Amino acid sequence: IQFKEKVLWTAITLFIFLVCCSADPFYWMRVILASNRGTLMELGISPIVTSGLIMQLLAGAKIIEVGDTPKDRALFNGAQKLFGMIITIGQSIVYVMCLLITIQLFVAGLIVLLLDELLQKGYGLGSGISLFIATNICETIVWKAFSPTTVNTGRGMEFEGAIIALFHLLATRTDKVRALREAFYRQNLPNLMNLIATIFVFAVVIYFQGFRVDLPIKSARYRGQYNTYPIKLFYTSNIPIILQSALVSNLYVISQMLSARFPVGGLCHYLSPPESFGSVLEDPVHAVVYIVFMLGSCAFFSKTWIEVSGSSAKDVAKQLKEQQMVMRGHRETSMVHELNRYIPTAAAFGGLCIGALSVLADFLGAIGSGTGILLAVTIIYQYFEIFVKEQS
Amino acid sequence: EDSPGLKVGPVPVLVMSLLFIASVFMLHIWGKYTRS
Amino acid sequence: FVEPSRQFVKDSIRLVKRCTKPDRKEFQKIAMATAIGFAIMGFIGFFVKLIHIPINNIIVGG
Secondary structure: OOOOHHHHHHHHHHHHHHHHHHOOOOOEEEHHOOOOOOOOOOOOOOOOOOOHHHHHHHOOOOOOOOOOOOOHHHHHHHHHHHHHHHHHHHHHHHHHOOOOOHHHHHHHHHOOOHHHHOOOOOOOOOOOHHHHHHHHHHHHOOOOOOOOOOOOOOOHHHHHHHHOOOHHHHHHHHHHOOOOOOOOOOOOOOOOHHHHHHHHHHHHHHHHOOEEEEEEEEEEEOOEEEEEEEEEEOHHHHHHHHHHHHHHHHHHOHHHHHHHHOOOOOHHHHHOOOOOOOOOOOOOHHHHHHHHHHHHHHHHHHHHHHHHOOHHHHHHHHHHHHEEEOOOOHHHHOOHHHHHOOOOOHHHHHHHHHHHHHHOOOOOOOOOOOHHHHHHHHHHHHHHHHHHHHHH | OOOOOOOOOOHHHHHHHHHHHHHHOOOOOOOOOOOO | OHHHHHHHHHHHHHOOOOOOOOOOOHHHHHHHHHHHHHHHOOHHHHHHHHHHHHOOOOOOOO
């Protein structure tokens, strides 16, 4: 109700999440998580996101459809809860084949499931799953720039390996010469330097989030009113662009040792070098074909999603027709003929930037995303303004 | 069961806290909160 | 040859010129807001380790 209330429902969920944190596991799973299950984490995000996206694929598909009833809503929620347990049992039994975390996991799937639904109702945007993604990403960038308690890459000459930190090196380094230059002792990835670059690539994405088009739009029966439609340049919410890049690399690499039952180095190498190997790379031609292949892949997931579960021609046409929208110079139908162009070209050129986040890893300190923490910051812009309006 | 449409109120907050405290403390073997 | 490639490249970078585009003060207001949000999400990793580590095990040398 109140903006004072609305923040309380966020504190509840905030502090609780703060204390808390194929035939093999998935890459993308590691991205959203940040502990890979700690001693209290008890897979706190994994089920909710796996369940929501299996179900969205099933739901979007034309075979079953969400009608306007209470009833399709109910079953979709029920369906997601049921999948969410299934995936956690499916996973967890495998690591067993020990006494402590198995018993605890069942009590911990009882907390999470209603909690996630405490911030879709108790708060506006975000979601429970969003809030968690944002925190877990922001976590692992900051811990390595302050004091990692493991090892601090870039600068070394100590083989303790267990208290080597960024602040710990800052004290020993003043008793000699600078290593805060473009010179470092072993330059694997200087971690102070990697953060400066992190915040650079953030800057070009938010620039394009300000790019969106608004339209004023009149109604049919009575022409004397005007409403609005916002057309957001981005599409598919950027989730099956980031996810689908990853999950096709799994299905090749798992299979290689599976084919043997029925070679880590060579087979991987020659099909896809992973990520960048710097501004000088490591391959004069192997890295090039990979990058060009990647952007093609990512551009293509967007153009296939929109028709079959996403929003495109028909899903937008249904929307306007309800309230009988018409165009000033034309009609209903022929807005649809201009977003036949727009939706594919905007969508997939959107994609070619969610791809050009993922290859960076030496100018980006994020654990895979991109997408998931940035959807969180866009949602802050929306809520931050709401709080400035009421205050003034 | 799944009949509730709404999922906010005092009561869900008490249920999440009550469980969260057994998870943190009761089942741990490290601090000797239960013995086997 | 393939027709569509060349035309998709046109229709994508002229439709960024139908967008309203950032103004100076408005690029500042989003750009300020970003730097706050991620310092909050910072704090998760540091504090929760002191309750975690001496409970989980005692061998750590700290």
